[PDB]
Amino acid sequence: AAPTLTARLYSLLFRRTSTFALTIAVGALFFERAFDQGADAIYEHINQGKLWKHIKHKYENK
Amino acid sequence: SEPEHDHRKRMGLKMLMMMGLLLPLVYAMKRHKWSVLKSRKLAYRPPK
Amino acid sequence: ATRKLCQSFQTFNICYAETGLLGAHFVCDNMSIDDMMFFLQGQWMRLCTSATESEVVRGKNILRNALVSHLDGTTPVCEDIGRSLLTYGRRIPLAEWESRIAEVDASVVREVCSKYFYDQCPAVAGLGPIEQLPDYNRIRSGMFWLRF
Amino acid sequence: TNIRKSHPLMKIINNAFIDLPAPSNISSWWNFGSLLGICLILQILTGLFLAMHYTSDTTTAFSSVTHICRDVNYGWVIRYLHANGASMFFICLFIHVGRGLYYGSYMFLETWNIGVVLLFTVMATAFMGYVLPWGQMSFWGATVITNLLSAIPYIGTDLVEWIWGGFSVDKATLTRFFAFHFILPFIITALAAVHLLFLHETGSNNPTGISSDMDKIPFHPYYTIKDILGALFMMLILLILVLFSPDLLGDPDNYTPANPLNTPPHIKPEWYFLFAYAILRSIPNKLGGVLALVASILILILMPMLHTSKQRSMMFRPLSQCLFWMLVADLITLTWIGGQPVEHPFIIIGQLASILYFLIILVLMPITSIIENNLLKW
Amino acid sequence: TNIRKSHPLMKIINNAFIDLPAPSNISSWWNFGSLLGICLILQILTGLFLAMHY
Amino acid sequence: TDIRVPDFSDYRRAEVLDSTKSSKESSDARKGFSYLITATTTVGVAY
Amino acid sequence: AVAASSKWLEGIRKWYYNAAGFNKLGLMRDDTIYEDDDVKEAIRRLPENLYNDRVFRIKRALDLTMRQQILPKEQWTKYEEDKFYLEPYLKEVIRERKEREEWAKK
Amino acid sequence: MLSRFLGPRYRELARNWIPTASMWGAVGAVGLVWATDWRLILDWVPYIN
Amino acid sequence: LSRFLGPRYRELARNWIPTASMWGAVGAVGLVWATDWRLILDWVPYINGKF
Amino acid sequence: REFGHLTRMRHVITYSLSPFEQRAFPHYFTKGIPNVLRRTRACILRVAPPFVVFYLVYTWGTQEFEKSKRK
Numbered sequence A: 001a002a003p004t005l006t007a008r009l010y011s012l013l014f015r016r017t018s019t020f021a022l023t024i025a026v027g028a029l030f031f032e033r034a035f036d037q038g039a040d041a042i043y044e045h046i047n048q049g050k051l052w053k054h055i056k057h058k059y060e061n062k
Numbered sequence B: 001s002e003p004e005h006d007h008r009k010r011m012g013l014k015m016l017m018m019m020g021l022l023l024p025l026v027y028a029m030k031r032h033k034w035s036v037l038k039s040r041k042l043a044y045r046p047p048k
Numbered sequence C: 001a002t003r004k005l006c007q008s009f010q011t012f013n014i015c016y017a018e019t020g021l022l023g024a025h026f027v028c029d030n031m032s033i034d035d036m037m038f039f040l041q042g043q044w045m046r047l048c049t050s051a052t053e054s055e056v057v058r059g060k061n062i063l064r065n066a067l068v069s070h071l072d073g074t075t076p077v078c079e080d081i082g083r084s085l086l087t088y089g090r091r092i093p094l095a096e097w098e099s100r101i102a103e104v105d106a107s108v109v110r111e112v113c114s115k116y117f118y119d120q121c122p123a124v125a126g127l128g129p130i131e132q133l134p135d136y137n138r139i140r141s142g143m144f145w146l147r148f
Numbered sequence D: 001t002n003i004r005k006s007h008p009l010m011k012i013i014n015n016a017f018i019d020l021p022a023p024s025n026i027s028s029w030w031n032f033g034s035l036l037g038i039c040l041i042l043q044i045l046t047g048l049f050l051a052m053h054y055t056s057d058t059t060t061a062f063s064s065v066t067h068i069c070r071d072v073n074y075g076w077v078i079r080y081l082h083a084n085g086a087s088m089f090f091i092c093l094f095i096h097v098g099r100g101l102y103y104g105s106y107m108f109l110e111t112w113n114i115g116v117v118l119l120f121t122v123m124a125t126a127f128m129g130y131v132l133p134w135g136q137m138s139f140w141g142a143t144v145i146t147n148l149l150s151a152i153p154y155i156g157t158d159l160v161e162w163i164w165g166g167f168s169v170d171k172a173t174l175t176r177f178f179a180f181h182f183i184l185p186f187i188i189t190a191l192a193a194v195h196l197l198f199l200h201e202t203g204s205n206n207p208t209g210i211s212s213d214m215d216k217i218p219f220h221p222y223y224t225i226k227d228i229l230g231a232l233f234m235m236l237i238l239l240i241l242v243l244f245s246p247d248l249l250g251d252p253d254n255y256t257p258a259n260p261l262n263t264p265p266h267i268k269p270e271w272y273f274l275f276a277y278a279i280l281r282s283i284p285n286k287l288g289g290v291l292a293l294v295a296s297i298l299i300l301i302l303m304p305m306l307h308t309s310k311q312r313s314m315m316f317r318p319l320s321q322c323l324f325w326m327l328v329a330d331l332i333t334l335t336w337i338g339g340q341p342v343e344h345p346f347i348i349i350g351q352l353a354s355i356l357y358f359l360i361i362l363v364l365m366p367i368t369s370i371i372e373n374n375l376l377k378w
Numbered sequence E: 001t002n003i004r005k006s007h008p009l010m011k012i013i014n015n016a017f018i019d020l021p022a023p024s025n026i027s028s029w030w031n032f033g034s035l036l037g038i039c040l041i042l043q044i045l046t047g048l049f050l051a052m053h054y
Numbered sequence F: 001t002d003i004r005v006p007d008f009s010d011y012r013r014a015e016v017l018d019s020t021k022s023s024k025e026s027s028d029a030r031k032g033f034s035y036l037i038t039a040t041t042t043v044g045v046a047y
Numbered sequence G: 001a002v003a004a005s006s007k008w009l010e011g012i013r014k015w016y017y018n019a020a021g022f023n024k025l026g027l028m029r030d031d032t033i034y035e036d037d038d039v040k041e042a043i044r045r046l047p048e049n050l051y052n053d054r055v056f057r058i059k060r061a062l063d064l065t066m067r068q069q070i071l072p073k074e075q076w077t078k079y080e081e082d083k084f085y086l087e088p089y090l091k092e093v094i095r096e097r098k099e100r101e102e103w104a105k106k
Numbered sequence H: 001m002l003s004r005f006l007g008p009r010y011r012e013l014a015r016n017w018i019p020t021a022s023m024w025g026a027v028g029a030v031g032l033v034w035a036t037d038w039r040l041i042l043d044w045v046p047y048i049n
Numbered sequence I: 001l002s003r004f005l006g007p008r009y010r011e012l013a014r015n016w017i018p019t020a021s022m023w024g025a026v027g028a029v030g031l032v033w034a035t036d037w038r039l040i041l042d043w044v045p046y047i048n049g050k051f
Numbered sequence J: 001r002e003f004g005h006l007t008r009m010r011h012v013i014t015y016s017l018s019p020f021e022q023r024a025f026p027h028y029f030t031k032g033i034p035n036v037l038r039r040t041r042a043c044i045l046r047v048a049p050p051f052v053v054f055y056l057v058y059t060w061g062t063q064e065f066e067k068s069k070r071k
């Protein structure tokens, strides 16, 4: 009653002994530029002004 | 002597955010199955 | 019968005022429990899906024959009179029973079996030489199928 | 008509991994045997990439290794996986042996004896591969070993002449160190399948030593999911070292190319051979060193015969486990001494602790198991 | 207490090659399946020598 | 007829603790996310 | 065989009993013995009320270690109440092995 | 040859199998659209470029 | 121990020993043709070993 | 060694609950740290004092090597 009253995704996802081994193949998507956030956001924040694309504009235009 | 110094400190960020996802989610598959055994009760009733 | 798996099995349909029990009971030796549970659970899941229009016609013929054969004397008719007045509040006649059997077909059977059996937690009881009675995780995972 | 029970391939998988009766109280120390099979497949895949670009030639070998680290794509991540994926093999191997010694698992005699064969073939394969980068530690570690191999009085002096290729150190010198290093990991694999054919006859031991045929559970789903959780926790700690400190465990002096015209300040093996190097230098003879080396690994076969206790495991034996951690704290002392200069304090400690390693296994353990029997009234 | 019938390694060899029931009238054409396993081990040993110098 | 199943109230759900009137309804008012524990695992095993 | 300071060897036999902890799982001393071929013959010769008492005490202790638990300190097996139920049956199995061995040396 | 297929009540097993089937016909329409980084259906959705 | 010694096993060792010796001298002279032991091919000079 | 062939048992009863009738973490840190503090007080009197004997040799073994090179 009070606990989560949403949908149940075990009458379709994962339940299959097949999916246990199909989520190397069918479950293998959706999350590469959702994690081009964080990875390419906190690397280029601690490294402020030190990488090559932060300084190349000096020796780009003559 | 170490030309891959910058490429490895960012590739070591693209897996630390992937083990913060994957590792809590196999640990909760583990606690689901083992709760059958963790809650069971035992009784011994021999003839008097 | 062909693999001498059991001595007997039966299904039951126990009812109450607000709830019920729906299931099966079987008797076998100590080396056949795990194989009896495999075949029983695979036929529940073949009625949630895949239930044919020929199976339902035979199951409707069986249900009418079990109705009139149970009322064949003053003692069984008197107990169908006395407890229909305490459950339904009236005695349902044998014409109202038959006009409810005439409506059922395979889509109703598939829909009503999926509602009660599919992906649900059963209650299990076992007594005797039962070391080959499978684990409850392996029991509860029998309550789906691997394709549908 | 269960296809998991009647198919000719699927029966063997079902009997070994799915429907296998397993004790219910198996702890985390039983996970490191499947981690050894994870570490072994990883070293075979990574090693086959590194063999496509290596050249066995004492003039052009230090340069073949720098070519993968600076020119070949992903060569820096595959090379430093291999050097660090062998330190992980050896930390899992020493936890695995200390488990079977603590819980009495050597009583499976045919399983334990194939294990001691696996401990020799692993320690020999990691020696042949460290000479292959051909730096200042790869040369001055191979000439320390072959001096102790030409002291065997009847076969010793013609045997080192065969492994060096008939010469000292030339092109056909590293061709035999490279050939035995390619082959022995595929023999470690076949000896590990025979290792588990003998464990299947009794099933597993359990922390209590008492048999457990009343309280079995199936292997799937309970330990197929608990092992997967332990294998992902291993790849986390492994990739931390490849991507944050890949030179933490090695040595800088192996980045100087091999040249006898100069001399390194120290001779230092890897961290997992330092206990076996503190025992060679502890005996001032080339015969009592090659015999005290092989006696440190062959003493494991006497462990079934030296057991004089009424119980199997050390869970209920509190004086016998007080001596189990004196044996672990003595292989730590032999690892610190093994990377020190041969000076005044580092030899009185190196020989008083090479004695205590043999006095604990052979003498002090079987006498303390008897005092325990006498206090339990047998 | 026949050790050919009760040893865990030796049972598998005994069941597959020693005590196996075989037809009595097997001719020469059934020999070329073990000759394929001879030709396969030979190509693997010879091929590993040729890979050290290529 | 002398045995009774012992109580599981230290292991019950947040609400089925009271065993009176959650017969068939609230089998999904009990329930919509730890089945999806294995769903976001699919997306976590994914890349 | 001491007779004056037998006070001392009784304290050390009690101390090793409680430093060992098979009583905290509610076990008796003859439950924890390693079964070789002599012990597997002595178990087969027990009366059935003694055999059934031992199978349950072991199952309750394998289950207590699956959850890293200990019984409360009222169900711990006491020192002077451990019954050596197997030691009479095992001394006779060993004695019948040492007689078939002295007869093969003749 | 394949009169296993012909029957008045074997085609019962298809018309409820296709509401399952229709959807795994498009597991390539999401799965291998991602996985090769194909040029095909990327500019179709305005979110993913 | 007392499991092992007596008038039985050592008279089973009596007809063992010839077996042991011709299991030992099999290992002694058999090792020298496989691994090219040139220090023992000298002792019987009739066998031209290497050409 | 299959399941209905392992042993012989009489007069024992087992009661078990479904995985879907249970909350995930019943007692996590109200019971977790008094259970770990029980297992630490037991096996630290057998494990630790062997490793402080390595420590007193290490601290003495590099206080003799550094006086071996000076006055």
Ligand code: HEM
Binding pocket: D029, D030, D031, D032, D033, D034, D036, D037, D040, D096, D097, D100, D103, D105, D106, D108, D111, D112, D115, D116, D118, D119, D188, D192, D195, D196, D199, D203, D204, D205, D206, D300
């Ligand atoms: C390449 C090396 C090895 C591999 C792949 C390997 C593999 C395994 C595996 C998978 C198991 C079952 C899981 C487990 O109980 O942890 C096991 C058990 C065992 N291994 Fe190893 N092993 C290796 C080396 C060794 C060594 C060096 C020894 C001892 C000297 C050894 C002795 C044992 C024993 C005694 C057991 C059974 C323990 C028990 O059930 O209590 N193994 N091994």
Ligand code: HEM
Binding pocket: D040, D043, D044, D047, D048, D050, D051, D054, D065, D079, D082, D083, D086, D089, D125, D126, D129, D130, D132, D133, D181, D182, D185, D186
């Ligand atoms: C099974 C366990 C193995 C271990 C413990 C091991 C160990 C090692 C070690 C320690 C090195 C030295 C690396 C360095 O210092 O840079 C090395 C190098 C090497 N190994 Fe392995 N190895 C194993 C398997 C293999 C296999 C199976 C192969 C080949 C198929 C292989 C091929 C090589 C090659 C080519 C090198 C070249 C030198 C280099 O890249 O550094 N190894 N090995």
Ligand code: HEM
Binding pocket: E040, E043, E044, E047, E048, E050, E051, E054
């Ligand atoms: C299993 C069946 C195999 C077949 C049918 C086969 C066939 C061949 C053939 C036809 C050639 C060309 C021969 C020529 O030079 O005219 C060749 C060359 C070669 N093979 Fe194989 N091979 C087999 C296995 C292997 C294996 C297992 C290896 C390596 C471990 C290998 C390594 C090589 C190498 C290095 C060459 C180049 C050297 C040369 O050309 O002679 N082969 N192989």
Ligand SMILES: Cc1cccc(-n2nnn(C)c2=O)c1COc1ccn(-c2ccc(Cl)cc2)n1
Binding pocket: D016, D017, D020, D021, D022, D023, D026, D030, D033, D034, D196, D199, D200, D203, D204, D219, D223, D224, D227, D228
């Ligand atoms: C074959 C055999 C024989 C005897 C005992 C045991 N064994 N080992 N430990 N326990 C409790 C046992 O019963 C085994 C199993 O060996 C192992 C160890 C890990 N895996 C494994 C894990 C995950 C996956 Cl996906 C696949 C395999 N299999």
Ligand SMILES: Cc1cccc(-n2nnn(C)c2=O)c1COc1ccn(-c2ccc(Cl)cc2)n1
Binding pocket: D120, D123, D124, D126, D127, D128, D130, D131, D137, D138, D140, D141, D142, D144, D145, D267, D268, D269, D270, D271, D273, D274, D276, D277
């Ligand atoms: C002396 C010295 C210096 C530098 C490097 C290395 N070395 N060589 N390879 N690796 C990884 C190194 O660290 C060494 C060899 O050190 C030891 C000590 C005992 N073994 C040994 C034990 C068993 C077996 Cl079977 C084979 C060898 N090797």
